[PDB]
Symmetry: C5
Subunit: 269 residues, 5 copies
């Protein structure tokens, strides 16, 4: 079957199909994804007034991120269920093209909107020392956009053209390392002038940031992390990828937002 | 028909099918489930300001639990209606695979999110004495996650492999007993220093907790509680399970949340 | 056709079918039903602060009842439109089993949730004199549940077994009369100690309560109220039942809630 | 094809069909309808505290009207798109009975709910002089209900029985003229005692009321306003009717609500 | 086949079809569109109280624009997914007429509602000097309506009749130039008497306004901007148009709204 520039989920769906566990787990984990975002939305709105006026923009940005993210993750979950249909005869779920092909692009577009705001929002809680607010913001916004856009292009080729896949991924990675570099600077400068309690939370924010953000490129590469015809080029790789994306998105948005809010409270007088 | 690692609802649906009463009641009770969660959401938001600032995080946690739970229970209800279709010829509802197989996993994922928050939220109303807040929290969160994850794995095998079903269920039970142990400690320490009215509510919270949480393993086992080819391995067992899950979820979240809110009011200087 | 323990709507749908007027009116009236509930939700939230803090729980309870009532009535409306499909050849709507059979149980489960809260909520506005608060509450909650549960069982048999239908209905009625008895007591005791304006509203609340609550058993019996092969065992009876249920639910929840709120305002100082 | 007591939209759909422009425009205008209602809902909620406490019930009533209006108008829009399907062979949209017949009754039921509230709400902004509040309210509510109910019955016969159509329409019109009479009285009495700025707005409210409310009977009659086999008994008449209903509903609810809010501000210390 | 007066998306869909990238990207970008509107809605509501009472109407107008716009863009995204279905044999998405033809009219009707409010809302933040408030408002509202209505008519003919397409587009352009002229006047008069900070933001508002609003006519013409049988008369032109519309709508509403809110803050005592 000709699928063209399609995600590997479709190729697994079109050949081996998905077992009950593989199909149901992916449906469940993706549903958890958007459910957590809407739960987070309520949390962030309800806790806005827990911090001083000057910190509240960060709480507002956390809630705004939850909107977008809930709608895009909900669309991603519907895309998974509509793309794969039970075959009575073999008792597995196969590609149902009439529901459209499955594409991870809904999730990517959530990143496009939300990355700029997640990077931006910490600048409302911490004070920089050396760096100018507008400079850091502009670096975050440019590199954030380019990281997501180049990755979005790459992932269309993850089966149809491994070279394009890896080149676009590599370019994306460059922008990723730039963001990590700037965010480390922001964390360090944020630490000077604030209580030891505040410094501890910023340490935790950095570890959360580093682990959660590194998951994404892992999920990008997931199908190929065990090489050609590896364990992970399979329904097991599909499950692994969608779990990791869901953990990443929950961690990078909700937990991140909670930690920033807790920092804002400690700095609040 | 090969169904593989599927819930027993599908096997009943695929052989005997469901009577009008069995099918409609399950649809109704599952719908009640998500409707109560959204009603609860409004209640908890609207009553935030009925308690002192320091208690209000518990009300917020109750509302956050209602969100997740409404979406997952709504998805669980849609899964039931889509999976079973009326046959004109025999006048019963049979497995319609085109709607996907029915799986209770939507409900389980609601547990994964919400158990950590339900255990956590009492620590914002009561004061511990001897135990450290961070220690109790960490015990709740680790054991809560492991309980739900191991159960989630088990329930895929509830027909296809009785051994896996019962071993994963047993491991889940171990973590369950750990949580009961810690929650008893938390209740006892919570009772010290507070009015007799407050102590009465905490007693009631503990009974509600113990009964409501014990329903879950009952619902897990439901199809087999009358042995091989028993009364409950049937549409009657399907009805029983989905009723018990719905009662449990309403009790463990909404009533629990209401009792905690009533405790918060008694401990409030406004009262 | 084999329909088993199914509501009489399906039997009419399966034999005579529904005319355009019968089908459209039922769809419209059921839609009005859930629309009024969501309108009520907004009204009750927006008017919370029109009464003293000590009355506001009644306003909150009215809003909570609307949320469950809107969701269940909306589901009941979809059940109607999905269950009956236009036949081009005869120009009438017939049972389409693929949409599931039509059952009034969605409405009944709204009663199960909401009856306990409607009875309870008046105890936050009025003061009892002779009766104990916990006793009245317990009587309301026990009898409310038993009334709706026994009715819910009965209505499955409204065609398949007239005897079961009428026995379960009779048991339901007993619990109904108990509730009427207690509510009369509560109204009377509520009247003592309060302004004549407040007493007048409580008089009106009692008339509304008595008429609105009596409609339900009428709607239960509707198909048979003109005997065997009567005018009402027909699309006209289907229309009559769904109108009466909709009027009852609007009256017993929304108008009831408005009157209680107006009482709360008069008692507000 | 026998359609029975069905709206003329179905007869056009079943014979000539609808062009792309006719079908898409109707879908768009009906969508605009419910979108404006939800936009209005937010406006009215957000502006509640712009007026004195004693005027705020009018703002609340405007918001409550929007909730019913959005749900019913949304249902009316879905009824349109579901009822008419593209035919590849002729490139026109034809009646698809599987989606149900199209009926304007969803809109009518929005009137049933909302007319009583729109008439009522002005009595919270203006003071009567000679007329009794309870008398005006009761006249509005009785005549409002009878106007909508009689029209609702009439419109089922707009093709199948022109006599019934026009008699029910005529009866509806009588109640309409009664409402116009009472509302004129209410406007005049409202003008006494208030600033010239307030009087100007009440003049505008009367013109808006008179034009917007007169559109409805025009839309009722639309298909026949060019006589037998006229220009308007056609997809052009369908477009014209649905445009006029949408303009009327937006004017009579949203603009009306805005003008009343502006009056409330004028009368506010 | 016969598509009649239909958008060029359908003609591409009906002949060449859409590749996975072309179809998925359009679905993603249109989804991003409505997601950003709902994220914006939350931002504007949550920041209302950041400005003086007298500026807050502008913040409220930004939120009201977000409602309409979210619903219309959401409908536009659904229209795209239901209109184009995967063909297993060739592995491309082709016109599925059963989902209705695709039409950009949902977006146009969002313009009809929202243009009048976007133009109006700046008059609540700036003070005019020479020009009269009522005159500017009336010019905006008349020309805004005529611009959108004439464009809406034109776009039906964008394949079926190039002459009608370009004449209606030209008339639309005339009203566009009128609006640009008046808005420049409003910006200039707004700048007189206010802080340098205020003047800077108004300069930025003008550049954003000019670029964002100019994108629309570009998107209108997109399929023909590379002439007969050009690169852009293709799935690439479909992608280009829907990207530009989405960027325009986000820029002209959300960014515009943020800048106006920031202006309101600087002018706030
Ligand atoms: C920041 C802006 C950077 C953009 C610069 C260059 C685009 C690079 C495009 C890379 C696409 C690679 C195509 C490819 O690898 O194709 C080889 C062959 O077709 C496989 O068999
Ligand atoms: C604007 C950026 C759009 C750039 C999209 C073009 C890149 C496509 C690409 O990388 O091509 C892969 C290679 O041709 C194998 O098919
Ligand atoms: C990590 C989750 C991995 C859990 C996998 C355990 C599967 C299992 O229990 O196997 C029994 C089955 O019947 C035969 O494969
Ligand atoms: C638990 C309550 C379940 C009660 C079951 C009701 C059965 C009934 O009343 O009806 C029996 C008869 O067969 C009707 O045709
Ligand atoms: C109140 C219900 C009144 C509804 C009855 C109206 C019937 C009608 O007007 O139709 C008469 C005509 O002779 C037949 O088409
Ligand atoms: C008022 C709106 C009515 C405007 C209708 C204009 C129709 C048009 O422009 O004509 C298309 C051309 O005749 C096709 O060949
Ligand atoms: C809430 C969403 C967030 C924080 C998203 C983060 C996304 C990334 C850090 C993505 C990184 C990627 C690479 C470094 C290479 C491959 C492509 C990406 C976009 C997945
Ligand atoms: C809000 C939902 C709650 C409180 C969920 C509670 C879930 C349990 C206590 C589950 C217990 C289980 C066992 C002890 C064994 C079998 C598997 C489980 C997960 C059902
Ligand atoms: C908002 C919902 C309310 C107040 C529901 C009330 C329901 C009843 C009073 C039902 C009464 C019934 C009987 C007395 C006999 C037949 C069965 C019932 C449940 C319809
Ligand atoms: C918000 C909705 C409003 C204000 C609805 C108004 C409806 C009317 C004034 C209807 C009038 C009619 C007649 C006078 C004759 C024909 C039937 C009606 C109902 C369309
Ligand atoms: C949020 C929506 C906005 C600001 C919409 C703006 C729309 C335009 C400026 C449209 C302009 C057009 C022309 C000048 C010619 C072709 C037709 C139009 C309507 C696209
Ligand atoms: C995975 C759980 C996600 C649930 C939604 C987010 C809820 C936020 C929890 C707040 C915790 C409060 C800690 C403050 C000390
Ligand atoms: C079916 C709809 C699902 C509900 C989604 C819930 C999240 C929406 C966020 C709105 C919550 C508003 C809370 C504001 C309360 C302010 C303080 C308490 C008084
Ligand atoms: C003592 C005051 C407690 C009031 C109880 C109100 C309960 C509201 C919960 C709403 C959830 C739906 C009902 C099951
Ligand atoms: C003035 C008192 C405080 C305002 C409370 C805000 C209420 C937020 C409600 C959240 C959602 C509840 C259910 C939504 C109805 C479903 C809509 C479809
Ligand atoms: C054939 C039965 C074997 C299945 C047993 C699975 C138990 C897994 C438990 C892991 C700990
Ligand atoms: C003081 C009296 C105020 C009465 C307000 C009535 C509003 C009721 C709204 C319920 C929704 C519509 C019901 C038809
Ligand atoms: C200033 C007072 C604030 C009042 C809070 C508003 C309460 C909103 C509750 C939700 C009402 C339902 C609205 C329907 C939304 C439909 C979405 C599609
Ligand atoms: C074939 C006819 C049989 C119909 C008789 C069914 C009647 C059942 C009534 C059961 C009563 C239960 C009492 C419960 C009280 C609480
Ligand atoms: C004080 C001046 C009046 C402000 C007018 C605000 C306009 C309200 C808009 C609400 C509904 C939006 C859709 C209407 C467009 C037709
Ligand atoms: C700062 C003042 C707070 C006032 C609260 C107003 C919020 C009301 C929002 C409810 C209206 C819903 C309209 C959009 C819903 C989107 C659909 C999902
Ligand atoms: C009450 C008025 C009903 C009028 C019906 C007229 C029917 C005419 C039949 C040809
Ligand atoms: C001065 C404060 C600036 C913060 C504004 C950010 C709010 C924007 C919310 C809408 C979603 C953003 C998507 C952009 C791409
Ligand atoms: C400081 C408290 C302010 C309370 C106002 C917050 C209410 C905003 C709700 C508006 C709706 C935004 C989008 C909701 C998404 C839900 C979709 C389901
Ligand atoms: C406003 C005027 C619209 C211009 C319409 C031009 C029609 C051109 C006719 C060409 C032959 C089909
Ligand atoms: C950084 C990780 C780089 C991964 C190296 C690319 C491995 C390419 O392996 C690919 O695996 C597929 C499934 O097994 C095969 O179908 C492809 O033919 C093969 O190219
Ligand atoms: C601790 C709970 C008791 C578990 C007892 C497991 C014995 C169940 O036995 C099972 O019953 C099913 C239904 O009748 C049959 O289909 C299976 O063949 C049979 O293995
Ligand atoms: C208190 C009201 C109870 C009245 C019971 C009357 C018995 C109804 O009689 C039933 O009517 C049906 C249709 O008319 C028939 O099909 C049934 O054969 C018949 O049992
Ligand atoms: C405003 C009152 C106008 C009533 C005039 C009714 C005359 C219309 O007459 C009707 O027109 C239909 C379509 O043209 C025909 O199909 C019908 O046969 C005809 O009865
Ligand atoms: C601003 C641009 C003005 C419009 C340019 C006129 C070009 C019209 O060219 C058109 O291009 C289509 C696709 O190539 C062809 O299918 C049409 O038949 C042709 O009329
Ligand atoms: Na599926
Ligand atoms: Na079903
Ligand atoms: Na139907
Ligand atoms: Na259609
Ligand atoms: Na599609």
């Amino acid at each position: 079957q000709e699928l063209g520039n399609a995600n590997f989920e479709n190729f697994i769906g079109a050949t081996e199909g998905f077992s009950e566990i593989a199909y149901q787990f992916t449906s469940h984990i993706l549903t958890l994804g958007y459910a957590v975002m809407l739960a987070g939305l309520l949390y962030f709105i309800l806790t806005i007034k827990n911090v001083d006026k000057k910190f509240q923009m960060s709480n507002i940005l956390s809630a705004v991120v939850m909107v977008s993210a809930f709608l895009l993750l909900y669309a991603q979950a519907q895309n998974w269920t509509s793309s794969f249909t039970f075959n009575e005869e073999v008792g597995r779920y196969f590609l149902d093209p009439s529901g459209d092909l499955f594409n991870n692009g809904y999730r990517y577009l959530n990143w496009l909107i939300n990355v700029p705001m997640l990077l931006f929002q910490i600048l409302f809680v911490v004070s920089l020392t050396t760096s100018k607010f507008s400079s850091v913001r502009n670096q975050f916004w440019f590199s954030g956009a380019m990281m997501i856009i180049t990755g979005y292009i790459g992932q269309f080729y993850e089966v149809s053209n491994l070279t394009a896949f890896l080149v676009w991924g590599a370019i994306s990675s460059a922008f990723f390392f730039h963001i990590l570099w700037v965010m480390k600077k922001v964390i360090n400068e944020g630490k000077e002038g604030i209580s030891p309690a505040g410094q501890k939370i910023l340490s935790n924010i950095w570890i959360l940031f580093l682990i959660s953000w590194t998951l994404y490129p892992g999920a990008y590469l997931m199908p190929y992390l065990t090489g050609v015809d590896g364990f992970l080029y399979s329904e097991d790789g599909v499950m692994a990828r969608q779990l990791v994306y869901t953990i990443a998105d929950v961690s990078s948005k909700v937990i991140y937002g909670v930690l920033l809010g807790n920092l804002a409270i400690t700095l609040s007088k």
